[PDB]
Amino acid sequence: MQPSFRIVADGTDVTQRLNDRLLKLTLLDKPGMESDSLTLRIDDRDGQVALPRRGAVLEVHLGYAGEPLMRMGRFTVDTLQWAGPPDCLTVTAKAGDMRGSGKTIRSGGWEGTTLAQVCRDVGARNGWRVECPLQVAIARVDQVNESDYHFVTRLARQYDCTAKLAEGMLMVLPRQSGQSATGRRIEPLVLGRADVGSFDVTFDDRSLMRTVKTRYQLPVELKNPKAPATAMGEHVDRHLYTSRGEAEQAAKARLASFSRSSASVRLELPGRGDLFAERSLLLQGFKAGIDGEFLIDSVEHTYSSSGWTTVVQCNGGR
Amino acid sequence: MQPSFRIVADGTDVTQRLNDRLLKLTLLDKPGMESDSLTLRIDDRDGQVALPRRGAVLEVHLGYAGEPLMRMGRFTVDTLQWAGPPDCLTVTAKAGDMRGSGKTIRSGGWEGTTLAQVCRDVGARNGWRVECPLQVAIARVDQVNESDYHFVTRLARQYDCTAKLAEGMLMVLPRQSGQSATGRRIEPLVLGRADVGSFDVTFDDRSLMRTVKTRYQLPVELKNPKAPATAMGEHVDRHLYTSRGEAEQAAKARLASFSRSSASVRLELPGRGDLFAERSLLLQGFKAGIDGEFLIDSVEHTYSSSGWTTVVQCNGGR
Amino acid sequence: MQPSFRIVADGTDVTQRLNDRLLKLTLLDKPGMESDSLTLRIDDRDGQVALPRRGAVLEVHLGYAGEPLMRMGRFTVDTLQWAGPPDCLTVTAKAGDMRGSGKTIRSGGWEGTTLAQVCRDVGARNGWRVECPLQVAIARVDQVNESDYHFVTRLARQYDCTAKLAEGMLMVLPRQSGQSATGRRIEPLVLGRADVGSFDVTFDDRSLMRTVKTRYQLPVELKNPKAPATAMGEHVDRHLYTSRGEAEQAAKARLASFSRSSASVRLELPGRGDLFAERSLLLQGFKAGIDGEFLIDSVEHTYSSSGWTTVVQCNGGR
Numbered sequence: 001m002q003p004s005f006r007i008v009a010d011g012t013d014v015t016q017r018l019n020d021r022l023l024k025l026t027l028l029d030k031p032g033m034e035s036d037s038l039t040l041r042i043d044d045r046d047g048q049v050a051l052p053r054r055g056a057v058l059e060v061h062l063g064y065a066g067e068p069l070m071r072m073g074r075f076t077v078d079t080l081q082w083a084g085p086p087d088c089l090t091v092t093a094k095a096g097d098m099r100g101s102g103k104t105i106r107s108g109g110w111e112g113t114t115l116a117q118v119c120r121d122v123g124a125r126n127g128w129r130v131e132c133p134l135q136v137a138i139a140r141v142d143q144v145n146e147s148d149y150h151f152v153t154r155l156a157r158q159y160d161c162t163a164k165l166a167e168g169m170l171m172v173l174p175r176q177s178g179q180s181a182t183g184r185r186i187e188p189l190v191l192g193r194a195d196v197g198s199f200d201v202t203f204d205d206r207s208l209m210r211t212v213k214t215r216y217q218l219p220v221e222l223k224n225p226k227a228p229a230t231a232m233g234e235h236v237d238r239h240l241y242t243s244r245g246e247a248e249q250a251a252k253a254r255l256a257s258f259s260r261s262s263a264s265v266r267l268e269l270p271g272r273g274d275l276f277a278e279r280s281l282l283l284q285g286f287k288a289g290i291d292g293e294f295l296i297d298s299v300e301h302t303y304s305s306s307g308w309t310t311v312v313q314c315n316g317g318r
Numbered sequence: 319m320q321p322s323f324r325i326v327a328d329g330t331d332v333t334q335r336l337n338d339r340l341l342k343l344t345l346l347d348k349p350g351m352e353s354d355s356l357t358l359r360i361d362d363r364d365g366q367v368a369l370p371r372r373g374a375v376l377e378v379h380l381g382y383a384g385e386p387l388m389r390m391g392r393f394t395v396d397t398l399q400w401a402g403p404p405d406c407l408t409v410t411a412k413a414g415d416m417r418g419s420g421k422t423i424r425s426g427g428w429e430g431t432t433l434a435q436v437c438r439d440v441g442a443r444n445g446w447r448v449e450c451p452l453q454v455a456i457a458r459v460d461q462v463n464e465s466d467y468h469f470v471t472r473l474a475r476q477y478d479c480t481a482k483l484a485e486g487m488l489m490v491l492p493r494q495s496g497q498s499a500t501g502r503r504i505e506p507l508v509l510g511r512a513d514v515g516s517f518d519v520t521f522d523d524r525s526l527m528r529t530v531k532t533r534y535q536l537p538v539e540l541k542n543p544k545a546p547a548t549a550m551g552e553h554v555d556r557h558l559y560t561s562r563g564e565a566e567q568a569a570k571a572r573l574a575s576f577s578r579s580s581a582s583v584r585l586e587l588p589g590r591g592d593l594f595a596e597r598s599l600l601l602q603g604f605k606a607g608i609d610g611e612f613l614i615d616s617v618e619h620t621y622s623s624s625g626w627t628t629v630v631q632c633n634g635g636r
Numbered sequence: 637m638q639p640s641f642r643i644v645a646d647g648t649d650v651t652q653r654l655n656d657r658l659l660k661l662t663l664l665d666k667p668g669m670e671s672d673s674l675t676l677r678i679d680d681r682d683g684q685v686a687l688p689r690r691g692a693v694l695e696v697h698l699g700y701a702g703e704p705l706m707r708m709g710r711f712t713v714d715t716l717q718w719a720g721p722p723d724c725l726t727v728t729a730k731a732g733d734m735r736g737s738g739k740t741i742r743s744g745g746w747e748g749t750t751l752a753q754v755c756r757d758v759g760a761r762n763g764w765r766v767e768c769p770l771q772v773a774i775a776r777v778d779q780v781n782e783s784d785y786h787f788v789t790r791l792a793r794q795y796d797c798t799a800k801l802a803e804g805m806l807m808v809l810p811r812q813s814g815q816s817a818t819g820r821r822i823e824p825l826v827l828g829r830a831d832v833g834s835f836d837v838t839f840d841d842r843s844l845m846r847t848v849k850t851r852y853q854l855p856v857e858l859k860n861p862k863a864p865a866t867a868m869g870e871h872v873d874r875h876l877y878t879s880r881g882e883a884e885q886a887a888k889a890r891l892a893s894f895s896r897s898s899a900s901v902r903l904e905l906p907g908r909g910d911l912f913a914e915r916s917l918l919l920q921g922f923k924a925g926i927d928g929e930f931l932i933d934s935v936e937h938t939y940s941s942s943g944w945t946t947v948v949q950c951n952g953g954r
Contacts, residue, residue, distance in 0.1 A: 051925040054841055055868075078841040082926075084834030084904075101841040105872055150875060198402030205372055205396040205419040232373075236423050239468055268402075289369040290400075516720030523690055523714040523737045550691075554741050557786055586720075607687040608718075 008059035013052045025303035029277035035095035035173040038075050044087035063273050070273030073174045076100035095173035096131045104130040109147030116142035134176040144245035165246045166253045192285035197268035207258045210236035214247035228255050229318045263316035271308030275299040293317040326377035331370045343621035347595035353413035353491040356393050362405035381591050388591030391492045394418035413491035414449045422448040427465030434460035452494040462563035483564045484571045510603035515586035525576045528554035532565035546573050547636045581634035589626030593617040611635040644695035649688045661939035665913035671731035671809040674711050680723035699909050706909030709810045712736035731809035732767045740766040745783030752778035770812040780881035801882045802889045828921035833904035843894045846872035850883035864891050865954045899952035907944030911935040929953040
């Protein structure tokens with residue numbers, strides 16, 4: 001049991017003095033509303049570590065000494081702090097390598113003959129946009145007049161692409177891939193009582209759907225699902241906004257976002273590195289209404305003076 | 319001095335093992351924005367308490383052993399949690415018995431010949447709506463074109479019925495009764511120094527009205543009160559939204575909601591159970607500008623390993 | 637080293653018993669969104685200090701005993717609290733003397749021939765408005781149709797005058813003067829390592845502009861700056877709202893509000909009283925990318941049982 005780390009800087013970030021002078025770490029794997037985020041805390045002997053390149057690519061490997069290190073991601077430095085008497089730092093770093101916190105704010109609008117989530121990310125984001133090679137494997141028949149009027153281009157994925165017209169979208173910024181949820185890639189795990197430090201296995205019935213109904217064009221109708229993984233309920237009818245042709249099948253989007261809050265674990269673990277936001281967990285060795293699949297929201301790998309606390313949050317993956 | 323409790327489950331919630339395995343409690347009596355809320359914390363001897371019926375009616379009685387227990391309310395379980403090493407629970411439960419967190423989201427719109435707060439709750443909520451037998455004793459002449467366009471039916475009480483067109487409304491979800499404030503029922507009390515644990519007797523002059531002026535139909539006028547329980551002020555003119563015929567007398571609504579923040583106590587007590595959100599307090603035994611009536615906002619009855627902390631918050635009841 | 641204080645009440649607030657019975661203090665010097673704020677904490681020997689005049693003018697002097705006291709400001713009491721067993725108070729007080737938390741809510745609209753920030757504060761706020769003698773030294777050619785439709789008159793400075801059409805505005809409520817930033821008055825200082833208790837020297841690249849582009853009238857164009865004190869960037873294009881003639885030069889407003897978050901120190905000091913929101917700091921004796929000018933956001937002078945903690949926050953003053 002001995003954690004180690006390899007911070008590949010690919011240049012003159014610091015002259016590999018980060019191996020000597022770390023104090024803590026955090027990580028994330030967030031599909032929702034944010035990217036990943038390194039944190040560093042670096043000593044000073046009255047000034048030894050210069051302010052690094054704000055926009056330097058960092059490659060991070062974690063794991064134990066005497067074991068092969070896991071793929072952890074690649075990062076680019078955005079924000080920097082300092083401290084008082086101990087002279088700390090917080091060299092934080094976000095996901096995208098070729099584009100970090102710059103050159104992503106070129107927006108526009110699309111025409112009617114644009115197949116959505118093909119002509120939005122595969123066919124539109126390759127012409128020097130937010131993050132180029134990310135793709136969506138949804139290729140449904142979409143010939144609706146659709147455009148971003150004026151949205152921030154990382155909120156333009158949210159107001160029209162990957163939250164409202166999601167139908168389960170991930171928009172995970174690292175590794176340049178925004179997929180859907182419910183397990184596009186075959187990765188199971190097994191957890192028990194003899195692995196886990198703590199829990200928060202919550203449940204909500206404020207956010208139970210029983211039906212999901214949407215809105216259509218004015219010349220206004222609705223198409224609904226009738227079993228949101230529950231048979232104990234009869235009727236719930238909720239509406240937020242209108243639509244033209246997008247919510248003809250995007251009632252499946254609200255099947256997720258209310259039932260993702262229906263069951264949510266938050267369990268702490270010592271260091272594995274076998275934990276990502278696209279993998280499902282089989283929480284074995286628990287009580288009656290807990291055992292089952294859970295899609296992992298976020299994994300928070302940390303160093304400290306204590307070790308690893310890889311906090312894993314999840315949603316109800318049915 | 320010995321607190322006791324009777325949790326009547328009226329079914330197979332748990333087989334009365336809750337009498338053996340509690341750890342804490344909370345309660346509320348909230349007129350504003352929420353219902354009441356039980357909390358429970360229940361042991362596990364590596365799994366003894368199964369996950370209860372999410373929607374089981376619970377009747378709660380509190381008080382001391384050797385005294386008659388007080389009416390505390392009836393509750394239906396919505397949310398459930400867990401914990402780490404000690405294996406806790408939070409079996410929380412909201413107000414309404416026949417309708418808890420389900421089957422309340424059927425909305426609609428009304429016509430012009432609808433007397434407001436009679437044809438809204440007495441004459442509209444009896445046809446299988448949010449919570450059926452709750453009534454409003456305001457029967458004023460209201461022949462205005464009024465309708466909910468699309469509101470959540472518990473926010474439809476707030477955006478159009480019991481906050482904007484309130485004139486003092488309570489909308490207290492337990493016991494199926496949403497009344498007005500300023501004491502429709504004759505219940506006084508007396509408190510002193512020898513009863514109370516702590517205080518927070520706040521005051522605000524950021525939210526002092528001196529007049530209250532509203533808006534009318536376009537073919538726009540205003541009718542105002544000139545003494546919001548103060549004579550030290552001269553002029554304050556505030557407007558938020560327009561109205562058709564509702565704010566002809568709903569300038570009395572803003573007389574409350576700014577002067578409810580004018581004086582607000584928050585005093586802790588040991589266990590009584592004689593404290594509800596509809597009762598006025600006479601805080602005797604205090605300083606000069608404190609003694610007087612106070613309508614109770616919320617009462618928070620708790621168990622612990624310490625005992626009772628019945629936190630009582632109030633507003634300025636003039 | 638002995639802090640002293642002179643609370644000039646100019647009347648029968650308390651009979652100078654505040655010199656005997658204080659416990660703590662806070663102050664502010666906030667240009668943004670708030671005024672200054674005293675706090676007091678006053679003992680009770682079961683009731684000795686009556687509730688003071690809510691609207692009594694207080695003059696505050698601070699500094700050390702044996703030194704001339706500094707100008708700290710004048711204040712008017714608004715909010716009051718109490719406490720539990722120790723019987724505290726929080727006699728808080730805001731900036732304006734002639735107008736505190738009252739008689740400031742008279743609004744209106746202006747015509748086309750109104751030179752902005754002359755006919756808005758110098759030529760409009762002298763007719764019994766929010767705070768009378770405050771002035772703006774910006775006298776640019778503004779013949780645009782401009783009016784407040786219905787804004788709160790302290791938000792009417794924010795939605796149209798000193799945040800959106802700011803171009804660096806301060807709107808500092810004490811001493812009746814709302815100026816622009818970037819040092820209209822010649823006041824430098826020098827700080828080092830041997831003066832300062834702690835730090836938070838943050839940086840942000842989420843809020844870096846590279847260009848700043850605005851919007852115009854419909855018969856829509858843009859005029860932009862191309863160097864927001866950076867040469868490491870190439871293109872950032874951000875838009876929020878349209879304009880008629882105001883954002884012809886108000887692209888300089890967004891040059892500040894994004895680069896004010898680009899560098900932000902927050903350093904604690906023992907008591908000086910030589911620190912105001914309009915003064916620039918020269919943080920000497922530090923590392924490479926820290927040394928330079930910093931416009932002070934806010935100074936927080938406090939008493940305690942420990943002494944002074946004059947927390948000084950700043951922005952990047954280029």
